[PDB]
Amino acid sequence: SVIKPEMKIKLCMRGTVNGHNFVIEGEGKGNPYEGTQILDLNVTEGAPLPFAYDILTTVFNRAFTKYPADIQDYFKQTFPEGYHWERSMTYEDQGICTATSNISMRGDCFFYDIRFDGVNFPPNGPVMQKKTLKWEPSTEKMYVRDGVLKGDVNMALLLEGGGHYRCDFKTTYKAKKDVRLPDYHFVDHRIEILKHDKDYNKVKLYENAVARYSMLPSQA
Amino acid sequence: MVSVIKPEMKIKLCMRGTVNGHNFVIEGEGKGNPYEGTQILDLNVTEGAPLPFAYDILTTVFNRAFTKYPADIQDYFKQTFPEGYHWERSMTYEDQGICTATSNISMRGDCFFYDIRFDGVNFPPNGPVMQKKTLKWEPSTEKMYVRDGVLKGDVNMALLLEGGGHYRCDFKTTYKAKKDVRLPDYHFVDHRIEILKHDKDYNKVKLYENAVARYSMLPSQA
Amino acid sequence: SVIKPEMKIKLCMRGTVNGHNFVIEGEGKGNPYEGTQILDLNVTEGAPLPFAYDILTTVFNRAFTKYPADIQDYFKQTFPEGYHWERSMTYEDQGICTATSNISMRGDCFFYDIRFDGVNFPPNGPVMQKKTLKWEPSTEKMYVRDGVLKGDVNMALLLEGGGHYRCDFKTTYKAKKDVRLPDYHFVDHRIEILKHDKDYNKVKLYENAVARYSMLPSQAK
Amino acid sequence: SVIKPEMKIKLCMRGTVNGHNFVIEGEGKGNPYEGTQILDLNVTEGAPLPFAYDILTTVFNRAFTKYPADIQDYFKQTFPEGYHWERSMTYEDQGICTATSNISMRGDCFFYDIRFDGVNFPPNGPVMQKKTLKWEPSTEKMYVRDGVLKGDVNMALLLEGGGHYRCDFKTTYKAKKDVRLPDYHFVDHRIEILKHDKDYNKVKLYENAVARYSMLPSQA
Numbered sequence: 087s088v089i090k091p092e093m094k095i096k097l098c099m100r101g102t103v104n105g106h107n108f109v110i111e112g113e114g115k116g117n118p119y120e121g122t123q124i125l126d127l128n129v130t131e132g133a134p135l136p137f138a139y140d141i142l143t144t145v146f147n148r149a150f151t152k153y154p155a156d157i158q159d160y161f162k163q164t165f166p167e168g169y170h171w172e173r174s175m176t177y178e179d180q181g182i183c184t185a186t187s188n189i190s191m192r193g194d195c196f197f198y199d200i201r202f203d204g205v206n207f208p209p210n211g212p213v214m215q216k217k218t219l220k221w222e223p224s225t226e227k228m229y230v231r232d233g234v235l236k237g238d239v240n241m242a243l244l245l246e247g248g249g250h251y252r253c254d255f256k257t258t259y260k261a262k263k264d265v266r267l268p269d270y271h272f273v274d275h276r277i278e279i280l281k282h283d284k285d286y287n288k289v290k291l292y293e294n295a296v297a298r299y300s301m302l303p304s305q306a
Numbered sequence: 307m308v309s310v311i312k313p314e315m316k317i318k319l320c321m322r323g324t325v326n327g328h329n330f331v332i333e334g335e336g337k338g339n340p341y342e343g344t345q346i347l348d349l350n351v352t353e354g355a356p357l358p359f360a361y362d363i364l365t366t367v368f369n370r371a372f373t374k375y376p377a378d379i380q381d382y383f384k385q386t387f388p389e390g391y392h393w394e395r396s397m398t399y400e401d402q403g404i405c406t407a408t409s410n411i412s413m414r415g416d417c418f419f420y421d422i423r424f425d426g427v428n429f430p431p432n433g434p435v436m437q438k439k440t441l442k443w444e445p446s447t448e449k450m451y452v453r454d455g456v457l458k459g460d461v462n463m464a465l466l467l468e469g470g471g472h473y474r475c476d477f478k479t480t481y482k483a484k485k486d487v488r489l490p491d492y493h494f495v496d497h498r499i500e501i502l503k504h505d506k507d508y509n510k511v512k513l514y515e516n517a518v519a520r521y522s523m524l525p526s527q528a
Numbered sequence: 529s530v531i532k533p534e535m536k537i538k539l540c541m542r543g544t545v546n547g548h549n550f551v552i553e554g555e556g557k558g559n560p561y562e563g564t565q566i567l568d569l570n571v572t573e574g575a576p577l578p579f580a581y582d583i584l585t586t587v588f589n590r591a592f593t594k595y596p597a598d599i600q601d602y603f604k605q606t607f608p609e610g611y612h613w614e615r616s617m618t619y620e621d622q623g624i625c626t627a628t629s630n631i632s633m634r635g636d637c638f639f640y641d642i643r644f645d646g647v648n649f650p651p652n653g654p655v656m657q658k659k660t661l662k663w664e665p666s667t668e669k670m671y672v673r674d675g676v677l678k679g680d681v682n683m684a685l686l687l688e689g690g691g692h693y694r695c696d697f698k699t700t701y702k703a704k705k706d707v708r709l710p711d712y713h714f715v716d717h718r719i720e721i722l723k724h725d726k727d728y729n730k731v732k733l734y735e736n737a738v739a740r741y742s743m744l745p746s747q748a749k
Numbered sequence: 750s751v752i753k754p755e756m757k758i759k760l761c762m763r764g765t766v767n768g769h770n771f772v773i774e775g776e777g778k779g780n781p782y783e784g785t786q787i788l789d790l791n792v793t794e795g796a797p798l799p800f801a802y803d804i805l806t807t808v809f810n811r812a813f814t815k816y817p818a819d820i821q822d823y824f825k826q827t828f829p830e831g832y833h834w835e836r837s838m839t840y841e842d843q844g845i846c847t848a849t850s851n852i853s854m855r856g857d858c859f860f861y862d863i864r865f866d867g868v869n870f871p872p873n874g875p876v877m878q879k880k881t882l883k884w885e886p887s888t889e890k891m892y893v894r895d896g897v898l899k900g901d902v903n904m905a906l907l908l909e910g911g912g913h914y915r916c917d918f919k920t921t922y923k924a925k926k927d928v929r930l931p932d933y934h935f936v937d938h939r940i941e942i943l944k945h946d947k948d949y950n951k952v953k954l955y956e957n958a959v960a961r962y963s964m965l966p967s968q969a
Contacts, residue, residue, distance in 0.1 A: 182837040203864060205837050223522035275524070306442075396647050406625075428615075666890070692892045718967065741886075745939075747957075
């Protein structure tokens with residue numbers, strides 16, 4: 087396999103949120119077969135960001151997912167040619183983000199070219215007031231649609247004053263070559279900011295992701 | 307400790323509904339094991355048979371008291387008895403068919419009683435609901451979170467279709483206790499709902515659910 | 529025509545909002561070809577209602593629409609047999625209402641049998657806190673889909689103390705016989721509560737609705 | 750006033766739809782007090798576009814709106830400083846587009862700096878199969894929220910075959926200086942492609958927009 091037990095990551099995100107332009111560079115490494123990874127992210131244009139950094143973090147690669155052998159791994163199969171994915175993120179106060187990420191590979195390093203856009207966030211809402219603490223861990227539902235793989239996940243930001251702020255993710259993952267498509271399944275995630283400075287100019291970010299079927303037995 | 311929710315509980319319910327303008331009534335009787343998160347219902351269409359739409363759109367409306375809760379997650383549902391609770395749900399399908407439901411859940415003795423209203427609007431006539439092209443719901447993971455002193459649960463649901471592929475529905479439920487109960491932290495309920503048996507028109511259906519609550523299985527690094 | 533210049537209206541709404549059951553009866557009259565009507569509405573079960581009465585009022589009949597001769601009138605064509613319609617009302621704080629109304633006629637009177645449900649309204653939102661003043665006038669977009677007529681409208685409640693609370697309506701209107709189907713067109717509305725008592729047990733309700741094409745010409749190529 | 754009876758237009762849009770990157774330049778002119786304008790658009794990168802051009806056209810300036818004297822004109826008031834706007838475009842098959850446009854002025858010319866993104870369009874749907882004929886004329890609902898102006902409009906594309914494909918627009922318009930805010934009102938639109946070459950590399954585009962209150966009298 088061209089996907090090595092350890093893979094490096096280099097990325098560039100260009101984005102606009104609430105009319106504010108920014109650029110973030112990232113580099114890191116992970117263990118694709120263990121489903122873990124760490125990124126160091128640096129804001130290079132647009133500092134200090136005026137919005138909650140958490141809206142960006144799930145856009146900073148399902149190749150980093152532990153797949154059991156009885157679930158087809160759409161993502162690792164797509165390399166070396168790679169894949170791109172598209173996502174809409176619809177927040178409960180009708181802020182909407184979109185993102186597109188093109189994922190390529192050279193040697194033992196993935197490269198991501200990322201676009202991120204955010205519109206219609208209310209000025210006193212938790213994104214523009216930076217009142218989020220973290221995403222909760224989540225379970226993404228993965229299902230084939232029209233020859234590509236979709237993943238939908240109900241996401242929730244824990245808020246500074248207590249309670250949660252909900253966002254619905256709809257992602258489409260698109261291999262650049264023909265691969266075997268998987269059966270319906272789940273990817274459980276936990277994404278965490280491990281360290282940040284005061285304005286989130288420098289952020290260290292970790293994700294754990296593991297695929298599974300339901301382990302509830304079927305009675306029919 | 308001793309609970310009014312016994313290891314086995316019976317169920318009696320009545321659903322009154324309208325889908326695509328078609329009125330119907332369904333009666334159900336069954337039993338389950340609330341602490342094991344399992345249950346079986348026998349359902350009979352008593353008015354409006356045969357139904358002209360996919361029976362699967364109804365099945366998650368036929369009680370989170372039937373959920374296996376680990377000791378370290380507050381069980382919102384079992385705490386609320388005997389007084390009970392009601393819940394409200396919207397079910398938004400990807401072709402903009404929309405269903406709503408309200409269910410009032412009470413208890414007498416060893417039996418739960420549900421009084422259910424179900425409505426569905428704007429299902430496309432050639433879509434999988436009105437063409438009865440669904441096979442089952444997939445198993446699911448519902449996200450539970452407190453808001454305004456009550457419990458919300460949201461779940462991304464998918465119907466497997468005849469011929470392949472899935473038809474998606476977004477569920478938003480609010481669960482509302484009739485008495486004060488200890489509120490849980492954010493958590494998950496994994497479900498698998500299954501029709502075990504049905505006659506040709508689904509006038510008689512046997513329905514099973516397994517539901518288990520959990521936190522994430524993944525450790526935290528931070 | 530079986531639709532006379534003045535028609536009477538009788539209706540019954542049975543509903544549940546936020547778990548609260550209620551029943552409302554209505555009686556009134558209007559002028560179908562002028563697009564105007566008045567209803568007198570009385571809560572007979574569930575009083576006093578604990579939610580904003582405005583969420584109900586557009587559910588209390590597009591036969592009352594002034595249709596120009598060059599737009600097919602889906603609604604008047606379907607009588608005497610009548611029609612039913614189905615609606616979802618998605619509010620911006622994710623309260624959702626559904627309604628189904630079956631509309632029949634006997635003699636000079638329309639009859640509506642209505643079901644109304646509302647779920648997941650936030651307890652401190654403007655519906656459960658009765659902070660609405662009125663619906664703004666609106667423009668509904670009408671289009672045929674799969675042999676029946678859809679109408680979608682962006683609606684807005686003006687709030688006490690200012691600003692608006694938005695709701696997206698999606699309605700399907702279903703004739704009980706074959707009728708000539710219209711081209712894409714618009715229905716402009718203004719619905720108004722003319723009078724109510726303290727708890728809205730007794731409400732007097734008016735609607736004006738007029739169909740049209742766009743007022744803007746198409747540019748020659 | 751700095752808004753002359755005829756104003757020129759220059760714009761650049763950079764975008765990504767379905768993972769396809771493109772750039773479009775435009776130039777034109779219009780009559781802001783008549784609510785009319787014409788643009789000639791030229792695809793400079795990413796030609797030919799693989800998706801229906803109609804998804805772009807409403808992103809190619811409410812300063813071109815006929816405002817009666819009794820409705821405050823949010824858009825003309827904000828010049829010369831200008832404004833930016835943000836929009837989400839949610840299609841009924843859950844394709845979603847976002848756009849952000851920054852509108853500035855120099856002399857008798859408007860300048861637009863536009864970003865457009867489109868995600869999750871079905872591969873055999875009418876956008877990616879280029880089955881759209883036009884937008885229908887529309888009525889946008891304009892209402893103040895949190896000190897800025899929102900406009901929401903139910904849009905419909907007429908399709909090859911004669912049915913319609915629906916999209917819901919939510920726009921926030923954001924002045925760069927304090928302006929008199931309008932009461933709730935309507936903007937009626939008709940946008941039309943007047944001429945195009947085979948692949949829509951070159952498009953001539955017209956919009957007519959007119960603000961009004963409801964014509965219907967109030968009985969209360």
